[PDB]
Subunit: 45 residues, 2 copies
């Protein structure tokens, strides 16, 4: 049962996005905070 | 640093792939073994 992969920083948040500006996997909190204004896509997208 | 994310199964393997069949982040070993023949793309593409 290792379906969900979580953020290294926000431990209970699933990594569901990829920040293109940083070539970095991100969770919702990462994308709205440290990565605000960066270009991104949800992984499924 | 905390940006590179490593697989929880294959400890020294980074999650660089996304298995489209399962909508799940995978590392090289995950993709070739547990996800054999599933559709995938490297995150960077
Ligand atoms: Zn995060
Ligand atoms: Zn970013
Ligand atoms: Zn798969
Ligand atoms: Zn793996």
């Amino acid at each position: 049962g290792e379906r969900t992969v979580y953020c290294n920083v926000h431990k209970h948040e699933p990594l569901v996005l990829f920040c293109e500006s940083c070539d970095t996997l991100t969770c919702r909190d990462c994308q709205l905070n440290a990565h605000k204004d960066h270009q991104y896509q949800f992984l499924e997208d």
